[PDB]
Amino acid sequence: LIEPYGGTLVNLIDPEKREALKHEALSLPSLDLDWQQQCELEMLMTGAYSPLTGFMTRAQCARVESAQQLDDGSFWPSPITLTSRDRALADRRPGERLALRDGEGYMLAILTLSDVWKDGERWHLAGEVEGAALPPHPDFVSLRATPAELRALFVRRGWRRIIAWQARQPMHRAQYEFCLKSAIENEANLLLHPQVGGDITEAPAYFGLVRSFLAIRDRFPAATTQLSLLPAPPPEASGRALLLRAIVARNFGCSLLIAGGDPSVAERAEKIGVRLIAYPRMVYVEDRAEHLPEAEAPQGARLLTLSGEEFQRRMRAGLKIPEWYSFPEVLAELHRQTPPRERQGFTVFFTGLSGAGKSTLARALAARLMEMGGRCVTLLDGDIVRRHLSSELGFSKAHRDVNVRRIGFVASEITKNRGIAICAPIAPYRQTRRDVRAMIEAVGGFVEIHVATPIEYEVPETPELAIDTTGLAIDEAVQQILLKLEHEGYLRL
Amino acid sequence: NQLIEPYGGTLVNLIDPEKREALKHEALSLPSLDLDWQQQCELEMLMTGAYSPLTGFMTRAQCARVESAQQLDDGSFWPSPITLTSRDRALADRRPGERLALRDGEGYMLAILTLSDVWKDGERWHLAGEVEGAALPPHPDFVSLRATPAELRALFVRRGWRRIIAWQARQPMHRAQYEFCLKSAIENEANLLLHPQVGGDITEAPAYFGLVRSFLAIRDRFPAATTQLSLLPAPPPEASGRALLLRAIVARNFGCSLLIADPSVAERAEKIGVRLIAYPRMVYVEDRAEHLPEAEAPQGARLLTLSGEEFQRRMRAGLKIPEWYSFPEVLAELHRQTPPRERQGFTVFFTGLSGAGKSTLARALAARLMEMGGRCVTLLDGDIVRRHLSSELGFSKAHRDVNVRRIGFVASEITKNRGIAICAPIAPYRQTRRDVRAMIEAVGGFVEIHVATDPYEVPETPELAIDTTGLAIDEAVQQILLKLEHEGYLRLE
Amino acid sequence: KSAIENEANLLLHPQVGGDITEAPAYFGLVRSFLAIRDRFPAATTQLSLLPAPPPEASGRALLLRAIVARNFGCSLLIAGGDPSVAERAEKIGVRLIAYPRMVYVEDRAEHLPEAEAPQGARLLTLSGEEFQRRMRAGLKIPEWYSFPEVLAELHRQTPPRERQ
């Protein structure tokens, strides 16, 4: 079992000293970390970065970017540093002790300041760290191991040589099949170690990632495979990031690392004692009914592939996915997370002047869409919106802007949750619409309809539909927009 | 036989397109009444011939004379007062002779009423007089399925139909009603008209959509050459004999000579020319693999039934529904409309004093619930609610009590749409917390959790009351996952 | 329902004691629990093994199990398959609830303790002497008796004569 980097596993959390620090801190200045820094903190506090034992100092940081060493001259690929943009850090200085805490003022550790500087919008901090508590993680308690916890697990399991796969996205049949043979080929056990860092409201995407792993885990040999979470954001790809991950891989117990989705890095890496194998172009080889690395496929066999730009496409569109691409379970899960247009939520946003046949159109369009079922329709317009959402706003510039975003917000929740929301507020500023559209476009479908001809300030320069022509009965206009939705893909059988 | 002719002898039509432009013009210069959704139904029924010979709303004398001798001025038979109401103060100073513009809820003009009589009863105003129609209530939805008595009669005539049983459904049809219609039709050598009552508003009472959809779902189980589906624009009445006699009259005006629903009304009914057959207790007779009226079942055969109380219950709980009871399609459809608790939306509403523990619990509870997928979770608490819901709100008696409802509203939309909403605002008034609970309980699941660990007001009836004071977050969180698990709202693979 | 009724989490704690060659029957027991575990609420249920032979039934054995239940963390114990014992037990701080005659109540599509079933409802049962019989013989098992997974597992362990 490959022993920790530096030789011994760091642990910045001594319980004794713990009641200790909660104690000393009531009386200190405090920084509220953003979600990614708490990751970094947790990684450090927890030994993922052994031998490190505090955040690096501008000199140490600079010295990494050059010789890639610590003060020992020991090898270290990349700067571990604590940031923030709080304006309460501009008046702090070395020697001072800082309380570190979660976004909700929950106390994690005290930083003893080594160095303090700014570069760009944001502040950097340095110093030894003493930890009281780890970031609270109510979710996936079982699946979350510290490097120490995971190592212990490996030891009960009798494991020793271990390939790790530090996924940043869901796994289908090609990665699955390649992991399987990498593990047989290197006589290794397999650790599925998905990067999981996020927050319950700025970054809640990790939940789906975890769920897509839970979905296919049973496809894996039980005696040979382990699933655990790696609390960190995925890094950006660089030889440098890669070498760090190798290090945290080592600190977790793994002596092999898969990387994929040059001579130097291989070079250093197989130094720090972790062999990293690369992920090749996998092709489905129909003549053999299995995926192979492209270069191992037999001559003139027909090879079969499916791009992501294409997978994603078929998924949005309800198209057929080949049986050899992924498993039914994963597919079913990816569809519970991100539905086909056919089945996803969307808001219909009417814009124009108080030739507010807007309202009349909106009501009629509601009625029609209600014939469908499957998705619930809400009309955000008259009584409803006064009564509940802007019970009393003025007619100020910003008051109306706020309204408008108010409605874009409630709309976004309706659509995030797979409903259809229909809105026709007064909105004259391209910008404020642009924000509403982005808000809801993130979480589902947005269809702007610009009413110009008065179906019987700033022009939308890019609607989905512009009811253009002059004599147009409600019926004809309504139809015209059911035509858009039908063509845009949102309606259903 | 033949096609039963209209009651009174000839089919009323209060809409002369020849006088249509003149009416839309005259109206502009008139006082106007905006009708509620049910009066527009009454108007549409009258305007359209469903109540032939009637040709205007009855007058206090005529109304009184119906409740007595059940006659018109002719002395012809008429079961029940047809009358137009409004709860509009602007009606108190209006008088016979005046002409009134009748309009839908959005000021769309329908007809002018020439006032015969104007009087008040309790909370509402009654109106009387001949009616001249311009337009019918706008109905974007189910255009195909909506026929006027004249349109329907014309249809019947192309279909070559003569003798017709009508079923004026007010609720979905399962195998018993279906099987009994089939035999009533064979037994009376009649064609069958499924005529579900459909009156509501896109918001006021958008329940009819489900009703129609449940009919569309099972229509294919019906013989094509013998069955017709059409909508009957009206609210279901409240069960009476005059009322039942009215429905018989509108059944007659639509073309039907038989009505399923006495029997001294089957007395007056047979009289105006429409035979009304009664719906018996249907039982599933295993010994015959078919439903029979209870009194026709063989003796000592095992009879099988399923109350609505019990159907409902099984549906809300995920329990098995017999196969003789319904059809897969209808079941599937009733489940898309009203899901099992397992799968339906619900808000978790934390209440207590400040009540930072409230917020902490709420966030933890959100994280846990997010492990589950299927339903999306939204935390309506901190930044979120400020930013978009209440950025601008005093601390008034009525500005905190608007903030709360504000959040009950957004929450209701989340849950209506099958999501879970988690809220922990400051709310000290029972009453306001009751209104919120009713608002969301209408559309889904509401679970109050009273965190007990101006002047506050301890909840008198929470679902869960966390008392014990030495509680860790984890223990409390669990304690509420218990409440939810036991209340039925949780599910898993 | 015991767990909802007592506002309690649930611990499935099968007795597992044996040897790999004189007593290898516990493997199947464990496997029949693994088979149906997913039918249980995850946030509310735990499966763990209790290394011991099952005892022989006696008020005395029962009180011991209550004790080991307590030592494991459990404050409630189900017993089933008198006033004294209840008496002592609820002393040592562990409430033991008894396992009643469960009947399948077709009028309600669910099992109820016999005494809670509605009047004149048809009740449905299946003895073990009868289950075991149908299993040896390839006969039909009612859908309301057990789950497909468990059945499938019991058949991988002990096949019909047809197949043994």
Side-chain angles (χ1 to χ4, degrees), chain A residues 1-15 17 19-21 24-82 84-86 88-92 94-101 103-117 120 123-159 161-235 237-261 263-270 272-280 282-301 303-315 317-322 324-352 354-385 387-452 454 457-483 485-493, chain B residues 2-4 6-17 19-88 90-122 125-203 205-261 263-266 268-270 272-280 282-298 300-308 310-311 313-315 317-385 388-391 393-396 398-429 431-453 455-457 459-466 468-490 492, chain C residues 1-55 57-81 83-90 92-100 102-121 123-135 137-142 144-164:
Chain A
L1 233 219
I2 185 170
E3 38 148 41
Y5 195 46
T8 133
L9 220 222
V10 175
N11 183 336
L12 262 40
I13 294 179
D14 192 345
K17 309 229 317 190
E19 216 48 19
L21 337 181
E24 152 168 1
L26 270 191
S27 77
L28 289 184
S30 65
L31 187 51
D32 282 337
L33 264 25
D34 60 30
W35 73 259
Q36 31 254 313
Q37 304 312 298
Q38 314 180 25
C39 278
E40 215 49 291
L41 170 58
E42 183 177 347
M43 291 274 69
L44 171 87
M45 211 141 52
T46 236
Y49 293 147
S50 307
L52 303 210
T53 200
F55 296 102
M56 283 173 181
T57 231
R58 221 216 76 91
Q60 328 198 259
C61 286
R63 163 156 211 70
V64 157
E65 323 221 50
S66 316
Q68 290 184 308
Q69 307 174 328
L70 271 26
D71 288 332
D72 312 23
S74 43
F75 164 87
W76 185 279
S78 187
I80 309 305
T81 195
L82 199 278
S84 172
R85 44 281 161 32
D86 179 0
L89 300 176
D91 60 0
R92 211 131 289 317
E96 310 206 76
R97 281 158 76 90
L98 231 183
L100 304 192
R101 347 185 94 171
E104 317 302 334
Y106 181 81
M107 139 86 180
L108 302 169
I110 80 77
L111 172 53
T112 321
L113 290 189
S114 282
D115 191 345
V116 176
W117 74 103
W123 255 271
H124 277 62
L125 313 175
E128 297 301 311
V129 172
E130 289 163 316
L134 321 67
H137 289 304
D139 54 294
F140 302 140
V141 144
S142 29
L143 287 168
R144 301 169 169 282
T146 54
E149 280 166 3
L150 223 204
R151 277 175 182 273
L153 207 253
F154 291 154
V155 164
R156 299 187 287 269
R157 286 259 255 166
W159 283 23
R161 184 198 213 101
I162 303 174
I163 321 185
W165 174 274
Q166 268 148 27
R168 60 197 67 97
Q169 268 176 3
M171 179 173 286
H172 305 281
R173 210 163 260 193
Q175 16 277 357
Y176 160 89
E177 274 181 19
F178 170 83
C179 279
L180 273 197
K181 64 132 52 169
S182 300
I184 78 207
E185 197 166 310
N186 293 261
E187 298 188 44
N189 307 258
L190 174 71
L191 171 66
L192 302 173
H193 215 22
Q195 264 136 13
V196 137
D199 199 55
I200 97 153
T201 134
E202 338 193 75
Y206 74 83
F207 283 87
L209 214 222
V210 170
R211 223 147 29 212
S212 88
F213 270 84
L214 289 166
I216 100 167
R217 172 182 53 183
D218 290 39
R219 299 276 180 181
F220 276 102
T224 256
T225 307
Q226 255 295 155
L227 172 77
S228 212
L229 309 174
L230 192 228
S238 100
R240 231 152 273 190
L242 209 227
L243 286 166
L244 215 200
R245 284 166 49 209
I247 298 203
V248 339
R250 180 192 177 161
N251 283 324
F252 271 99
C254 315
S255 62
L256 295 101
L257 214 230
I258 290 171
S264 147
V265 309
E267 297 311 12
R268 284 143 212 160
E270 168 89 293
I272 79 206
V274 52
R275 208 203 313 203
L276 69 201
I277 91 203
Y279 181 65
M282 300 302 289
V283 304
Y284 179 56
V285 189
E286 190 187 68
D287 295 64
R288 269 182 140 252
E290 40 182 23
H291 300 255
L292 297 169
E294 174 174 54
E296 294 186 12
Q299 297 262 40
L303 312 179
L304 286 189
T305 65
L306 207 249
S307 67
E309 286 138 0
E310 174 68 5
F311 183 67
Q312 212 263 81
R313 195 199 134 241
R314 301 188 169 174
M315 297 290 281
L319 299 179
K320 170 186 197 163
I321 312 303
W324 41 259
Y325 187 80
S326 190
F327 313 87
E329 315 97 74
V330 193
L331 290 188
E333 170 61 37
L334 294 174
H335 263 141
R336 278 183 269 106
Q337 303 173 21
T338 60
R341 295 201 179 81
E342 187 165 33
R343 221 128 67 72
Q344 66 172 180
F346 59 101
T347 92
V348 169
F349 207 97
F350 291 76
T351 171
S354 58
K358 271 184 309 184
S359 271
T360 333
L361 263 182
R363 259 184 85 89
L365 197 245
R368 290 296 329 253
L369 296 185
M370 287 189 172
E371 291 184 17
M372 289 185 317
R375 294 167 294 188
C376 287
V377 182
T378 294
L379 220 190
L380 288 177
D381 211 13
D383 329 315
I384 270 173
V385 177
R387 290 331 149 213
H388 305 291
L389 221 42
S390 67
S391 91
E392 280 123 52
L393 276 144
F395 291 108
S396 326
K397 269 162 173 156
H399 260 209
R400 272 344 228 198
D401 184 1
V402 111
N403 186 31
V404 144
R405 280 204 207 73
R406 185 91 101 214
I407 285 185
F409 173 66
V410 163
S412 74
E413 295 281 312
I414 305 309
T415 123
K416 165 207 207 160
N417 257 301
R418 272 186 208 139
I420 108 190
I422 295 160
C423 310
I426 26 58
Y429 297 24
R430 330 160 169 292
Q431 189 55 199
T432 274
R433 299 184 243 117
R434 209 169 286 156
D435 294 301
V436 169
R437 157 191 304 265
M439 204 199 331
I440 112 90
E441 227 160 58
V443 92
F446 189 83
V447 171
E448 193 176 3
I449 105 172
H450 175 207
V451 176
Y457 168 81
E458 314 181 14
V459 300
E461 41 203 24
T462 203
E464 276 65 27
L465 215 197
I467 70 188
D468 260 318
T469 91
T470 60
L472 267 214
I474 282 287
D475 287 354
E476 294 172 326
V478 160
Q479 190 48 35
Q480 189 58 49
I481 69 207
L482 290 165
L483 266 164
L485 304 167
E486 180 43 40
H487 294 168
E488 202 71 16
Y490 293 108
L491 295 202
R492 173 196 216 193
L493 279 337
Chain B
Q2 251 265 222
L3 236 219
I4 184 172
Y7 191 45
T10 128
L11 222 219
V12 176
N13 184 340
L14 260 39
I15 293 177
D16 191 345
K19 307 196 309 198
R20 214 249 292 157
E21 250 38 71
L23 294 168
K24 286 183 171 173
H25 182 72
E26 171 179 359
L28 291 171
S29 79
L30 286 185
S32 69
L33 190 50
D34 283 341
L35 263 25
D36 62 33
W37 74 256
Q38 32 254 312
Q39 304 313 295
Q40 312 178 22
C41 279
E42 217 49 289
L43 176 60
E44 186 181 352
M45 292 276 73
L46 171 88
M47 211 145 48
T48 235
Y51 296 146
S52 308
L54 299 215
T55 200
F57 296 104
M58 283 171 185
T59 230
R60 222 219 75 90
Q62 330 196 257
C63 287
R65 163 159 210 71
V66 155
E67 319 221 50
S68 311
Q70 291 184 312
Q71 305 177 330
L72 271 24
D73 288 333
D74 316 20
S76 41
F77 167 78
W78 186 277
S80 191
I82 312 301
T83 196
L84 199 275
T85 60
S86 180
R87 47 300 180 0
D88 180 0
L91 300 177
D93 50 64
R94 219 128 276 327
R95 5 113 201 278
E98 306 212 51
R99 280 159 74 90
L100 230 185
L102 305 172
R103 327 194 308 206
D104 71 11
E106 319 301 335
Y108 181 84
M109 134 89 181
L110 305 165
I112 81 74
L113 172 56
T114 318
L115 291 187
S116 281
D117 195 346
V118 175
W119 73 103
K120 200 167 171 167
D121 225 288
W125 261 274
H126 278 63
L127 311 174
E130 297 299 315
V131 173
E132 290 160 315
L136 321 68
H139 288 307
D141 55 297
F142 303 137
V143 144
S144 32
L145 292 169
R146 300 171 169 279
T148 53
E151 280 165 5
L152 226 197
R153 279 172 184 277
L155 207 256
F156 289 159
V157 166
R158 299 185 287 270
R159 286 257 256 167
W161 284 22
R162 292 179 285 159
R163 183 203 210 96
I164 306 165
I165 325 187
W167 172 275
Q168 273 151 22
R170 60 196 67 97
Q171 59 156 160
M173 180 169 284
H174 304 281
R175 186 162 292 173
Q177 18 278 356
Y178 160 89
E179 271 177 20
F180 170 80
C181 274
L182 274 201
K183 65 133 54 167
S184 298
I186 78 209
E187 197 164 313
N188 291 265
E189 295 186 46
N191 307 261
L192 176 67
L193 174 66
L194 302 171
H195 216 19
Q197 265 135 11
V198 138
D201 199 56
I202 63 180
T203 180
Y208 73 84
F209 281 90
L211 213 221
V212 171
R213 215 149 30 216
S214 82
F215 270 82
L216 286 167
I218 101 167
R219 176 182 52 184
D220 288 37
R221 300 275 179 177
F222 275 101
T226 259
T227 307
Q228 255 294 150
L229 174 71
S230 206
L231 310 173
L232 193 227
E238 260 318 86
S240 154
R242 318 50 216 241
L244 194 220
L245 284 164
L246 215 206
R247 283 164 53 205
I249 301 201
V250 343
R252 183 188 179 165
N253 284 324
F254 273 96
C256 310
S257 61
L258 295 101
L259 213 229
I260 289 172
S264 186
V265 308
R268 215 41 220 70
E270 187 85 58
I272 79 197
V274 51
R275 210 204 309 202
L276 68 201
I277 92 202
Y279 182 62
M282 301 304 288
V283 301
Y284 179 57
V285 188
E286 196 163 51
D287 293 64
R288 268 182 142 252
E290 52 183 17
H291 299 257
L292 298 168
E294 172 176 54
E296 296 189 13
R302 307 276 153 248
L303 313 189
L304 286 185
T305 65
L306 203 253
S307 68
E310 165 67 4
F311 181 68
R313 194 201 127 243
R314 293 186 173 178
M315 298 290 282
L319 301 179
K320 162 191 201 160
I321 311 291
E323 287 203 354
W324 36 265
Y325 186 74
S326 196
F327 303 88
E329 317 99 75
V330 193
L331 289 191
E333 170 64 35
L334 298 173
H335 265 138
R336 279 183 266 107
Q337 298 176 23
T338 57
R341 296 194 180 86
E342 183 165 42
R343 221 130 67 74
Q344 69 172 178
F346 61 102
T347 87
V348 164
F349 205 101
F350 291 76
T351 172
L353 334 77
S354 66
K358 273 184 307 180
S359 270
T360 336
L361 267 180
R363 254 184 88 91
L365 198 242
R368 292 296 326 255
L369 292 186
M370 284 194 182
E371 295 186 0
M372 281 162 187
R375 297 167 294 193
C376 287
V377 179
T378 292
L379 220 190
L380 288 179
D381 212 11
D383 326 317
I384 270 173
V385 176
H388 324 261
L389 266 30
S390 76
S391 19
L393 282 151
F395 292 106
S396 324
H399 265 213
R400 261 330 194 235
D401 182 285
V402 94
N403 175 66
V404 171
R405 280 207 183 70
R406 177 103 106 213
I407 284 187
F409 171 68
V410 167
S412 73
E413 290 281 310
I414 308 302
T415 128
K416 168 205 207 160
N417 255 301
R418 250 28 94 5
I420 107 187
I422 291 160
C423 307
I426 27 61
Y429 297 23
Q431 185 53 202
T432 275
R433 284 184 279 105
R434 183 65 65 185
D435 293 306
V436 170
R437 156 192 302 268
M439 206 200 330
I440 114 94
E441 230 160 55
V443 93
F446 188 82
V447 172
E448 188 174 6
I449 105 168
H450 173 209
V451 182
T453 168
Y456 206 50
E457 296 193 26
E460 41 204 26
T461 205
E463 275 67 30
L464 212 198
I466 71 189
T468 81
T469 35
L471 270 201
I473 281 290
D474 288 358
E475 295 175 323
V477 162
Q478 190 51 31
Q479 188 60 47
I480 73 210
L481 290 163
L482 268 160
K483 218 14 182 64
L484 304 170
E485 177 46 38
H486 293 172
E487 205 74 15
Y489 293 103
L490 296 202
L492 212 143
Chain C
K1 64 132 52 169
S2 300
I4 78 207
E5 197 166 310
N6 293 261
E7 298 188 44
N9 307 258
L10 174 71
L11 171 66
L12 302 173
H13 215 22
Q15 264 136 13
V16 137
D19 199 55
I20 97 153
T21 134
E22 338 193 75
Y26 74 83
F27 283 87
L29 214 222
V30 170
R31 223 147 29 212
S32 88
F33 270 84
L34 289 166
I36 100 167
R37 172 182 53 183
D38 290 39
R39 299 276 180 181
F40 276 102
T44 256
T45 307
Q46 255 295 155
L47 172 77
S48 212
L49 309 174
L50 192 228
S58 100
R60 231 152 273 190
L62 209 227
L63 286 166
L64 215 200
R65 284 166 49 209
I67 298 203
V68 339
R70 180 192 177 161
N71 283 324
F72 271 99
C74 315
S75 62
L76 295 101
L77 214 230
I78 290 171
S84 147
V85 309
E87 297 311 12
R88 284 143 212 160
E90 168 89 293
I92 79 206
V94 52
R95 208 203 313 203
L96 69 201
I97 91 203
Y99 181 65
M102 300 302 289
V103 304
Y104 179 56
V105 189
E106 190 187 68
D107 295 64
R108 269 182 140 252
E110 40 182 23
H111 300 255
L112 297 169
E114 174 174 54
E116 294 186 12
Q119 297 262 40
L123 312 179
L124 286 189
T125 65
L126 207 249
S127 67
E129 286 138 0
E130 174 68 5
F131 183 67
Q132 212 263 81
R133 195 199 134 241
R134 301 188 169 174
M135 297 290 281
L139 299 179
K140 170 186 197 163
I141 312 303
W144 41 259
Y145 187 80
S146 190
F147 313 87
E149 315 97 74
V150 193
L151 290 188
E153 170 61 37
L154 294 174
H155 263 141
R156 278 183 269 106
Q157 303 173 21
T158 60
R161 295 201 179 81
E162 187 165 33
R163 221 128 67 72
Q164 66 172 180

